Design an enzyme around this catalytic site. Sequence first.
Site, PDB file in Angstrom:
ATOM      1  CB  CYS A 226      38.798 -52.936 -31.727  1.00  0.00           C
ATOM      2  SG  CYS A 226      38.767 -54.541 -30.883  1.00  0.00           S
TER       3      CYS A 226
ATOM      4  NE  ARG B 294      34.192 -53.160 -30.433  1.00  0.00           N
ATOM      5  CZ  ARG B 294      33.148 -52.273 -31.194  1.00  0.00           C
ATOM      6  NH1 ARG B 294      32.214 -52.342 -29.924  1.00  0.00           N
ATOM      7  NH2 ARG B 294      33.210 -51.929 -32.825  1.00  0.00           N
TER       8      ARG B 294
ATOM      9  CD1 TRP C 202      43.438 -63.298 -33.017  1.00  0.00           C
ATOM     10  CD2 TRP C 202      43.489 -63.588 -31.336  1.00  0.00           C
ATOM     11  NE1 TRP C 202      42.574 -63.064 -32.743  1.00  0.00           N
ATOM     12  CE2 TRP C 202      42.292 -64.316 -32.186  1.00  0.00           C
ATOM     13  CE3 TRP C 202      43.324 -64.081 -29.508  1.00  0.00           C
ATOM     14  CZ2 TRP C 202      40.712 -64.267 -30.870  1.00  0.00           C
ATOM     15  CZ3 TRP C 202      42.139 -64.493 -29.263  1.00  0.00           C
ATOM     16  CH2 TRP C 202      40.999 -64.428 -29.593  1.00  0.00           C
TER      17      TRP C 202
ATOM     18  CD  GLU D 258      46.085 -55.715 -36.301  1.00  0.00           C
ATOM     19  OE1 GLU D 258      46.187 -54.538 -35.593  1.00  0.00           O
ATOM     20  OE2 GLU D 258      45.463 -56.460 -36.273  1.00  0.00           O
TER      21      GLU D 258
HETATM   22  C1  HEM Z   1      41.417 -60.605 -29.208  1.00  0.00           C
HETATM   23  C2  HEM Z   1      42.213 -60.532 -30.910  1.00  0.00           C
HETATM   24  C3  HEM Z   1      41.834 -57.999 -31.707  1.00  0.00           C
HETATM   25  C4  HEM Z   1      41.685 -58.188 -32.565  1.00  0.00           C
HETATM   26  C5  HEM Z   1      41.657 -59.617 -33.969  1.00  0.00           C
HETATM   27  C6  HEM Z   1      41.324 -57.055 -32.408  1.00  0.00           C
HETATM   28  C7  HEM Z   1      41.350 -56.236 -34.013  1.00  0.00           C
HETATM   29  C8  HEM Z   1      41.973 -54.749 -33.817  1.00  0.00           C
HETATM   30  C9  HEM Z   1      42.046 -53.727 -34.425  1.00  0.00           C
HETATM   31  C10 HEM Z   1      42.821 -54.675 -36.456  1.00  0.00           C
HETATM   32  C11 HEM Z   1      42.006 -53.036 -34.441  1.00  0.00           C
HETATM   33  C12 HEM Z   1      42.590 -51.610 -35.390  1.00  0.00           C
HETATM   34  C13 HEM Z   1      44.309 -51.205 -35.373  1.00  0.00           C
HETATM   35  C14 HEM Z   1      45.020 -50.664 -36.007  1.00  0.00           C
HETATM   36  O1  HEM Z   1      44.605 -50.602 -37.166  1.00  0.00           O
HETATM   37  O2  HEM Z   1      45.964 -49.656 -35.343  1.00  0.00           O
HETATM   38  C15 HEM Z   1      41.751 -52.749 -33.063  1.00  0.00           C
HETATM   39  C16 HEM Z   1      41.653 -51.500 -32.940  1.00  0.00           C
HETATM   40  C17 HEM Z   1      41.445 -51.085 -30.874  1.00  0.00           C
HETATM   41  N1  HEM Z   1      41.334 -52.581 -30.465  1.00  0.00           N
HETATM   42 FE1  HEM Z   1      41.323 -54.397 -30.653  1.00  0.00          FE
HETATM   43  N2  HEM Z   1      41.789 -56.459 -31.503  1.00  0.00           N
HETATM   44  C18 HEM Z   1      41.647 -57.267 -30.672  1.00  0.00           C
HETATM   45  C19 HEM Z   1      40.970 -57.531 -29.542  1.00  0.00           C
HETATM   46  C20 HEM Z   1      41.999 -56.581 -28.559  1.00  0.00           C
HETATM   47  C21 HEM Z   1      41.859 -56.440 -27.030  1.00  0.00           C
HETATM   48  C22 HEM Z   1      41.908 -56.949 -26.019  1.00  0.00           C
HETATM   49  C23 HEM Z   1      41.419 -55.106 -26.771  1.00  0.00           C
HETATM   50  C24 HEM Z   1      41.391 -54.432 -25.309  1.00  0.00           C
HETATM   51  C25 HEM Z   1      41.164 -55.146 -24.145  1.00  0.00           C
HETATM   52  C26 HEM Z   1      41.085 -54.523 -27.679  1.00  0.00           C
HETATM   53  C27 HEM Z   1      41.029 -52.817 -27.479  1.00  0.00           C
HETATM   54  C28 HEM Z   1      41.187 -52.519 -28.808  1.00  0.00           C
HETATM   55  C29 HEM Z   1      40.809 -50.760 -28.786  1.00  0.00           C
HETATM   56  C30 HEM Z   1      40.488 -49.557 -28.076  1.00  0.00           C
HETATM   57  C31 HEM Z   1      41.489 -50.113 -30.158  1.00  0.00           C
HETATM   58  C32 HEM Z   1      41.299 -49.116 -30.597  1.00  0.00           C
HETATM   59  C33 HEM Z   1      42.608 -48.017 -31.188  1.00  0.00           C
HETATM   60  C34 HEM Z   1      43.019 -46.876 -30.829  1.00  0.00           C
HETATM   61  O3  HEM Z   1      41.424 -45.889 -30.774  1.00  0.00           O
HETATM   62  O4  HEM Z   1      44.685 -46.693 -31.619  1.00  0.00           O
HETATM   63  N3  HEM Z   1      41.307 -55.033 -29.380  1.00  0.00           N
HETATM   64  N4  HEM Z   1      41.407 -53.979 -32.602  1.00  0.00           N
HETATM   65  C1  BYJ Z   2      48.331 -43.212 -31.314  1.00  0.00           C
HETATM   66  N1  BYJ Z   2      46.922 -44.330 -31.516  1.00  0.00           N
HETATM   67  C2  BYJ Z   2      47.544 -45.568 -30.580  1.00  0.00           C
HETATM   68  C3  BYJ Z   2      47.056 -46.663 -30.396  1.00  0.00           C
HETATM   69  C4  BYJ Z   2      47.423 -47.391 -31.672  1.00  0.00           C
HETATM   70  C5  BYJ Z   2      46.477 -48.676 -31.309  1.00  0.00           C
HETATM   71  C6  BYJ Z   2      45.831 -48.332 -30.537  1.00  0.00           C
HETATM   72  C7  BYJ Z   2      44.838 -50.247 -30.379  1.00  0.00           C
HETATM   73  C8  BYJ Z   2      45.098 -51.493 -31.420  1.00  0.00           C
HETATM   74  C9  BYJ Z   2      46.270 -51.127 -32.409  1.00  0.00           C
HETATM   75  C10 BYJ Z   2      46.812 -52.051 -33.533  1.00  0.00           C
HETATM   76  C11 BYJ Z   2      47.504 -52.803 -33.137  1.00  0.00           C
HETATM   77  C12 BYJ Z   2      46.319 -54.005 -31.765  1.00  0.00           C
HETATM   78  C13 BYJ Z   2      46.373 -54.149 -30.600  1.00  0.00           C
HETATM   79  C14 BYJ Z   2      45.295 -55.358 -30.111  1.00  0.00           C
HETATM   80  C15 BYJ Z   2      45.189 -55.302 -28.707  1.00  0.00           C
HETATM   81  C16 BYJ Z   2      44.846 -56.234 -30.918  1.00  0.00           C
HETATM   82  C17 BYJ Z   2      45.409 -55.933 -32.657  1.00  0.00           C
HETATM   83  N2  BYJ Z   2      45.138 -57.205 -33.462  1.00  0.00           N
HETATM   84  N3  BYJ Z   2      46.295 -55.589 -32.624  1.00  0.00           N
HETATM   85  C18 BYJ Z   2      46.286 -49.725 -31.595  1.00  0.00           C
END
Ligand code: HEM
Ligand code: BYJ
Lengths: 409, 415
Positions: A108, A111, A280, A285
């Site tokens: 992420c 963070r 957000w 994305e």
């Molecule tokens: C607040 C603004 C946030 C932004 C801009 C953001 C941005 C992102 C982005 C761009 C990804 C890549 C996901 C993808 O390409 O599908 C990601 C992944 C991820 N985010 Fe964040 N995120 C945010 C908030 C959060 C929050 C609130 C949580 C949990 C409490 C979180 C947990 C995660 C996790 C666990 C992943 C890994 C996804 C996976 O393994 O499939 N994010 N985030």
């Molecule tokens: C097999 N993967 C299942 C989960 C896919 C996934 C997990 C976490 C984030 C995302 C991208 C969507 C997202 C989530 C959050 C919290 C913020 C953000 N900007 N965008 C996809």
Amino acid sequence: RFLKVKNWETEVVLTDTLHLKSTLETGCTEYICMGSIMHPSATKDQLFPLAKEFIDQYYSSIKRFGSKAHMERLEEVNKEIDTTSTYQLKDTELIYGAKHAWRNASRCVGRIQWSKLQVFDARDCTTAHGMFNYICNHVKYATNKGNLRSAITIFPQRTDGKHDFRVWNSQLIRYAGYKQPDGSTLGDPANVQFTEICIQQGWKPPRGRFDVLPLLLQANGNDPELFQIPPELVLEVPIRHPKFEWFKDLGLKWYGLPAVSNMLLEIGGLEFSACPFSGWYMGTEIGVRDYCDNSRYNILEEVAKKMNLDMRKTSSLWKDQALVEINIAVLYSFQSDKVTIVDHHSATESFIKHMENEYRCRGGCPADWVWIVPPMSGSITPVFHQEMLNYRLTPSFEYQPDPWNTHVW
Amino acid sequence: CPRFLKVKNWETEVVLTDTLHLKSTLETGCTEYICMGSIMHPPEDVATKDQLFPLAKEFIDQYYSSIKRFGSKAHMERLEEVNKEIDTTSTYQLKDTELIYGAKHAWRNASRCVGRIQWSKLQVFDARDCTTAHGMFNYICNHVKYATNKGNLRSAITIFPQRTDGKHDFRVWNSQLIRYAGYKQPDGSTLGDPANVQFTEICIQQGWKPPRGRFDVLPLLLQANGNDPELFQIPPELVLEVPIRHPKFEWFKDLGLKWYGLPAVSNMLLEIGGLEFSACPFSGWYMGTEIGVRDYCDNSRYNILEEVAKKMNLDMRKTSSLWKDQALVEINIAVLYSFQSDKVTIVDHHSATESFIKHMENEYRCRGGCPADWVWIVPPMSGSITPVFHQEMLNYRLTPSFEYQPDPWNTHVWK
Ligand code: HEM
Ligand SMILES: CNCCCc1cccc(CCc2cc(C)cc(N)n2)c1
Ligand code: HEM
Ligand SMILES: CNCCCc1cccc(CCc2cc(C)cc(N)n2)c1
Ligand SMILES: C[C@H](O)[C@H](O)[C@H]1CNc2nc(N)[nH]c(=O)c2N1
Ligand SMILES: C[C@H](O)[C@H](O)[C@H]1CNc2nc(N)[nH]c(=O)c2N1
Ligand SMILES: [Zn+2]
């Protein structure tokens, strides 16, 4: 060992000590690296040391390690694990566990915000109707009229594996996908299977290009049930372009609230199979992946045509031009409708600053370069040039199987 | 380790099965508790007799397996002749056929290289008879002229004598055969290519007279048999260059940009059967993004986004306007257009990555795998609209291989 990570643009070197604290596996070995594999490879006895470790780091985080409160809590948790095959987190522990699972999420880039997370405790929930009420409140709180706020709603932990709480949607808000007789696909092809499960369950599809899916909610191992989110709670943005006045005619829209609902939250050996969380969007994305992936909405060629671009040879980079214009539109749209969104330049900047913060106060920051680097213009963002170490800290968010593969009705 | 590992392509659902990883020969840097996949680089002595034997056997076995003569009389005889040679001279010499095989496979095995569909088409020049720096200069000039081929570039490698005791190394001190000088000014600004300031200063100390311009080709600094390195100017007619212009923007010409046609890495070490070739310059042709994105638009390089964005009349005060992204595409359009117009071989990042996917799939079927470094294989712009972004890859180290080695000025004992 102390490990160093270098930024090759700024020559800044950070020193990672934090990795010494991980126990979970990455999947790599000394001979094979699986850094680009997306998904690599409890009882009383398993449960206590995990519980002990989490409780230990919690009281350590509040500077009361070895305290009377600490000792009692350890004693309390033991007698409860012993007598009930599980235990229950204190409220303070739940909040701490949820924030740190975000903090530890190596993939992420958002963070820097990790400690500003609204935590909704839904562990008293017992039915799908209850889940729907809880999720509606979440969506309402998090959307906040466009001023988006990070939130997580936490449903009851797994017990015997047969009474799992699950949100069957992969995200709270997504668009349907339909398999045309044509052979083409209307809507979002990513969701074609899930859309059909909802139809099969009684959902009446409008068969449009951007139909919001219903919620499919499973409570306590029972069959899942359908719910429509009240539309005034679903914030959407028509995508328009600041210089291309024809872009509006494309008929593109997206929703403002990204809310992942299919992951598993793990805290102190407890497993929360239903924990939808939201934040957000980073613009790419939507503008790169959702719209331009060949297996998604796949709009590049339509756009390049309205841009009157030569599309005969790849080396004219017509795809790269169209891609930039699309992402300009998305950013412009959300901003113009005062809906929170971050661009990949600002986001990756923030992340480098966050890394620095974490190295200074925590001795490291686990990060997955493959996921952190944006899917466009990689090396003109600072994270491209930033070495990162990836390792697994707990509490964490983990993947789990899709519910329609384990559940029988 | 499991015998079969699976990789998936998430765009096409195609799943491939890797068995080749079993032949992995050394460390990646990763452990099961930490992944160093994004780390760039995870004693002056040499291999002993007992270390050399199994390394040589391993390579010879592999060679005779490739020519479908495994276990033959010739195979066993070569094994015995190699063994005798290691035992009496503490080293051994490769046959020309083995040398050619080893070089081709070091490229084939190079996990960070997207151009490997071409690995079997490689001109190998055996320069193991070289004794002096003037001789190295002769060999390198011949390489450049052959590889350049008036713009119809041909991949090539020139291989100088292997390492012996470690005090007699052949080294090309240049990191690449053709690069532009960089000059730090008293006021802190840099002229030319900021990446090359250190090496340029070394050349200047060594006696080079610098033109002090923006695109001055550096001299070769060549070390033979462990002696002090010597300077030579590459004949300018042998350095093919391309002036950067743009199909639409006629002001682009006014930026006065150009680049050289031949990418030729000269600071890596080639390892074959435990033998170490510390000077082994190799060359191919460019992918556009190498120049358009990294050379031109890295902040620590020529850094031209701002000047280009200005001439494009773009709003440059909010990042969310994506003015950087817009100009980056245009810069890369110009680079491809300028090379194609002057008929100098170049490949765009769409064509290259698609070819590499086809290459990889073929390798999985015929070889049981294809080691690949996703972090390096995915292009530095527009990553997810290329097929390699969606491709799961396994990274592991096979031998023969190209390896990094210390910079020679760091280790050299000056006579
Ligand atoms: C607040 C603004 C946030 C932004 C801009 C953001 C941005 C992102 C982005 C761009 C990804 C890549 C996901 C993808 O390409 O599908 C990601 C992944 C991820 N985010 Fe964040 N995120 C945010 C908030 C959060 C929050 C609130 C949580 C949990 C409490 C979180 C947990 C995660 C996790 C666990 C992943 C890994 C996804 C996976 O393994 O499939 N994010 N985030
Ligand atoms: C097999 N993967 C299942 C989960 C896919 C996934 C997990 C976490 C984030 C995302 C991208 C969507 C997202 C989530 C959050 C919290 C913020 C953000 N900007 N965008 C996809
Ligand atoms: C023929 C066309 C070729 C193309 C299109 C090509 C493409 C590339 C590219 C784009 C890179 C990344 C370079 C960077 O970002 O600095 C690379 C790296 C590399 N290439 Fe190839 N290459 C070609 C030929 C060759 C040849 C002939 C060899 C060796 C015989 C070779 C060996 C390597 C090696 C060892 C790397 C590793 C880079 C490192 O770790 O520093 N390439 N190649
Ligand atoms: C630390 N410097 C080690 C060498 C750096 C380097 C190695 C390999 C390739 C490159 C980029 C130049 C290049 C070389 C070749 C053969 C082809 C190509 N397209 N581009 C740089
Ligand atoms: C094969 C590779 O692991 C896969 O395509 C990954 C690459 N990087 C990614 N990065 C982000 N942010 N999101 C993704 O879905 C992916 N997909
Ligand atoms: C830190 C990171 O590993 C580093 O910036 C890498 C990323 N990927 C790369 N990929 C290529 N092809 N070339 C590079 O120099 C780099 N640099
Ligand atoms: Zn790894």
